[PDB]
Design a binder for this molecule. Sequence first.
Ligand SMILES: Cn1c(=O)cc(CP(=O)(O)O)c2ccc(N3CCCC3)cc21
Ligand SMILES: Cn1c(=O)cc(CP(=O)(O)O)c2ccc(N3CCCC3)cc21
Ligand SMILES: [Zn+2]
Ligand SMILES: [Zn+2]
Length: 229
Amino acid sequence: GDQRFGDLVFRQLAPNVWQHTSYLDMPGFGAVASNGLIVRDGGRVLVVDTAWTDDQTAQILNWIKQEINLPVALAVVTHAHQDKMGGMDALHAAGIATYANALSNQLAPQEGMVAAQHSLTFAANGWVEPATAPNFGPLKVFYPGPGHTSDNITVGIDGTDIAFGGCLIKDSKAKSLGNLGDADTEHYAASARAFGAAFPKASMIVMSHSAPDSRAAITHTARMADKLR
Ligand SMILES: Cn1c(=O)cc(CP(=O)(O)O)c2ccc(N3CCCC3)cc21
Ligand SMILES: Cn1c(=O)cc(CP(=O)(O)O)c2ccc(N3CCCC3)cc21
Ligand SMILES: [Zn+2]
Ligand SMILES: [Zn+2]
């Protein structure tokens, strides 16, 4: 069920949830996938992560207009790297309210990214403070601790068995933890397990750069990360 639209792919995961996929040519790697989510909540649409670029992100909004034809209320981004935040200006151009971890907004300018308009803060138990994430509805946002990056956040969709760990979680067949340049190797394993414990009923774990996987993706990530302590 891959639906093509311009240079992006959309896959329905649940009645009100789609995966968006965009591609960037990376030296030595070919055309690399980056995934995010689109959630319909009543008369509005919510987006998790931008595409790699503004032009790709504008495509996501065009697909939404064509397939759903409801306004995009807000977008949240999972960390300050090009794959998840590279299209922030396309959301601003569209008048969409944007949210990121406060640390993601602090890091974004130096990473050559546009900061979100709103900063998220987190309770002691990792769950987003609702006063910083107003109107999020079925989007449940969780800071699991540092891993792929210090700012990485994760999201579950209430009324579904879907959770998304962004770049924190690797696929169950991965041979690498990937980008360790900005990673917290001492805390990585605990952060991966904290994500699994936050969404214990999630059976469909959306991957950052590959097709959806099982909870084995969380287990495999944490076991690889245990090796770096
Ligand atoms: C090279 N590179 C980069 O320079 C940057 C990314 C983005 P992030 O650090 O994963 O946020 C990247 C993402 C995926 C990726 N591939 C996945 C399968 C093979 C390589 C490469 C990436
Ligand atoms: C190899 N690899 C991979 O196999 C996978 C990733 C993506 P993730 O970090 O696991 O989400 C990846 C990301 C960045 C990267 N490098 C950036 C500079 C050189 C390579 C490599 C990655
Ligand atoms: Zn990243
Ligand atoms: Zn990644």
